[PDB]
Amino acid sequence: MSKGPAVGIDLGTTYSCVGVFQHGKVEIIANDQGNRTTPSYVAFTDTERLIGDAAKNQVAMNPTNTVFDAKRLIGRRFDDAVVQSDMKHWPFMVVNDAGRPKVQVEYKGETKSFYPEEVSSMVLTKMKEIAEAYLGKTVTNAVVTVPAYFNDSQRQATKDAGTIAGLNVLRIINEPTAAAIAYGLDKKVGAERNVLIFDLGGGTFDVSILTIEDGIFEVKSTAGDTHLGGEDFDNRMVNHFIAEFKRKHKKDISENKRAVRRLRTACERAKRTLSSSTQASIEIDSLYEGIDFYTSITRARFEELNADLFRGTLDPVEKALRDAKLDKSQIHDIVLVGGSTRIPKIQKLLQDFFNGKELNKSINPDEAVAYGAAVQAAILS
Amino acid sequence: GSNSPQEEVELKKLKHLEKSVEKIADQLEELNKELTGIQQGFLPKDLQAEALCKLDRRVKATIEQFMKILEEIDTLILPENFKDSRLKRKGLVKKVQAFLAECDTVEQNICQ
Ligand SMILES: Cc1ccc2ncnc(N)c2c1
Ligand SMILES: [Cl-]
């Protein structure tokens, strides 16, 4: 294979995305399964190592040996409050190796430990292979994104993950900076502009305020909730339908894991439908004890069930503005990143907070960060 | 006697699912035959527990495949007038559920 162009990779907590700037435009590259985003999952079995969709697809089968959330560990010390808190909820083992966290798994019948950058290199190897499979050319150069709050150790470890994956990391750039680059906010004529990045996706909520003066990006403030996402909105819908089944049939489906999973999957789909329709219907035959569950939910009810969570997204916005020493009227551009920003109520709440100001939302919010990184990668080529 | 072309679209998705169920049911049948073999006791007893527990990954893969079939079936919306599609969906869910209860029987007899 001949030498290909440089790529932009958004290394995410739950999913990763790879893009390429070619023919004057960014193309978001689909994986082997035809998916534009790949789960940041690595599975270790008795026979193989699985990355992405193949790793996520077998998680139920191999929960302990399926690693995810490596990004929550990368560049951190074992005794970090974040590492110690997150550990309680992971099915895989996290061990201490001289102050450093390591994931401990069973791989081909052997106990093996991996540093978070070794796990993240496996995900980066997959993104590199996804790019090569599409282009039909070798891929070496890439721009990899990191959250704006990442420290020196977290940034170095992400760069190290790229080096292990055989990538030449051209630059490491902030996720909110990548999103501002995607919308070309650094190319707009005039004085300094204040940009608010509203990132609600990949199981985290990040609000960043940037000051772009003569194309130079300055992080003024970062705020958010590290454990907020679409899964929280799904849980509210699941709870609504569990209560509804109890009211209608006087039966509790909650201790039947398969019934709860069928309902949860149906709610994830229903939530997505409610971003474009005002009603979503669900038909689940023989959900529990032979009872068919045929129901529906309106966008209004979904908004009612999640009213506190949606409104609560404005608290890190106000905190970011306060820390940046800025009034909401001083924000020139608002950018929506993450899949959950597709929710019409979230858009409505945010636009109303900014007194009817139009939102930058044209670029697919799941792909905006890889998009900006692909633009940067082409610029640095 | 008001069979619609639109219902043909639905019945085709269901038929495909029925075929997928047949392939997974064949894997379950093979697992059932292997589980039965080990139960005979021709293996050294000190090694019976490990052979039974070696069937765990396969049983779990079978369960997962049936769960993914149910999740796919659950995406279907069939109007009340699609009587034949509703009966095929119902029959298929019940068949998968009876296969899942057989998988559960295997899980209760291995790694114990
Ligand atoms: C692709 C897609 C479509 C609609 C959505 N609605 C809400 N949250 C998401 N994460 C969504 C993703
Ligand atoms: Cl593609």
Amino acid at A22: Q
Tokens of A271: 């939530």
Cβ(A109)–Cβ(A187) under 8 Å? no
* Residue ranges of chain A that CATH labels 3.30.30.30: 68-122
Amino acid at A261: R
A125 φ, ψ to 5°?
-60, -45
| Cα separation, A197 vs A205, whole angstroms | 11
Fold that domain A229-312 belongs to in CATH: Actin; Chain A, domain 4 (3.90.640)
The total number of structural domains in chain B stands at 1
Return all residues near A368 (Cβ < 8 A) that are at least 6 apart. A178, A179, A182, A183, A335, A336, A337
Residues in B 57-76 with any Cβ partner in A closer than 8 A: 57, 60-61, 63-64, 67, 70-71, 73-76
Is A262 close to B100, i.e. CB distance below 8 A?
Answer: no
CA nearest to A47 within chain B: B57
| Cα separation, A146 vs A174, whole angstroms | 5
A108 φ, ψ to 5°?
50, 45
In this structure, the strands spanning A333-337 and A193-201 are parallel
Pick one of 3.40.30.20, 3.30.420.40, 1.10.3720.10, 3.40.50.1220 as the CATH number of A188-228+313-360.
3.30.420.40
Q: Taking the CB of residue A61, how many other CB atoms lie within 10 A of it?
A: 20
Taking the alpha carbons of A263, A267, A269, A270 in that order, is the dihedral positive or negative?
Answer: positive
From B18's Cα to the closest Cα of chain A, the distance in A is 15
Please indicate whether residue A71 is annotated as part of the active site.
Answer: yes
The total number of residues shown for chain A amounts to 381
B1: domain range?
A: 1-112
Please indicate whether residue A175 is annotated as part of the active site.
Answer: yes
Cβ(A347)–Cβ(A341) under 8 Å? yes
CA triplet A309, A320, A323: central angle to 5 degrees?
145
Tokens of B38: 């080990």
| Cα separation, A305 vs A141, whole angstroms | 45
Radius of gyration of chain B (CA): 18
Return all residues near A378 (Cβ < 8 A) that are at least 6 apart. A5, A6, A21
| Cα separation, A155 vs A152, whole angstroms | 5
CA of A129 to the centre of ligand 2 (A): 13
Is B60 close to A281, i.e. CB distance below 8 A?
Answer: no
Tokens of A247: 């009211």
Long-range contacts of residues A260-265, Cβ cutoff 8 Å, at least 24 apart: A261/B67, A261/B71, A262/A287, A262/B70, A262/B71, A262/B74, A263/A238, A263/A287, A263/A293, A264/A234, A264/A238, A265/B71, A265/B74
The CATH number of residue B72's host domain is: 1.20.58.120
| CA-based nearest residue to A145, from A369, A375, A381 | A369
Please indicate whether residue A199 is annotated as part of the active site.
Answer: yes
Resolution in A: 2.1
| Cα separation, A37 vs A19, whole angstroms | 10
* Residue ranges of chain A that CATH labels 3.30.420.40: 1-67+123-187+361-381, 188-228+313-360
Q: Which helix (H) or strand (E) holds A114?
A: strand A110-114
Is A269 close to B75, i.e. CB distance below 8 A?
Answer: yes
Return all residues near A217 (Cβ < 8 A) that are at least 6 apart. A174, A177, A180, A186, A210, A211
| CA-based nearest residue to A366, from A275, A248, A298, A244 | A275
Helices (H), chain A: 53-57, 81-86, 116-135, 152-164, 175-182, 230-249, 257-273, 299-305, 307-312, 314-323, 344-353, 368-379
Report the phi/psi class of residue A203: left, alpha or beta, with left for phi > 0 and alpha for psi in -120 to 50. left
Per the DSSP assignment, residues forming a β-bridge with A173 are A145
Ligand 1 surroundings by CB, under 6 angstroms = A 230, 271-272, 275, 339-340, 342-343
Class of domain A68-122: alpha beta
Which of A35, A271, A273, A337 most suits a substitution to test ligand 1, by most atoms within 8 Å of the C-beta?
A271
| Cα separation, B54 vs B52, whole angstroms | 5
Tokens 């919308």, located at residue:
A183
Return all residues near A210 (Cβ < 8 A) that are at least 6 apart. A176, A177, A180, A194, A195, A197, A217, A218, A219, A220
Q: Which helix (H) or strand (E) holds B49?
A: helix B45-54
User: Chain-centre distance of CA B59, in angstroms?
Assistant: 11
Return all residues near A291 (Cβ < 8 A) that are at least 6 apart. A245, A249, A251
Is A285 close to B60, i.e. CB distance below 8 A?
Answer: no
C-alpha to C-alpha distances, B6 to A70, A116, A285, B78, nearest whole angstrom:
46, 51, 21, 10
| Cα separation, B64 vs B58, whole angstroms | 10
Class of domain A1-67+123-187+361-381: alpha beta
CA triplet B21, A60, A43: central angle to 5 degrees?
115
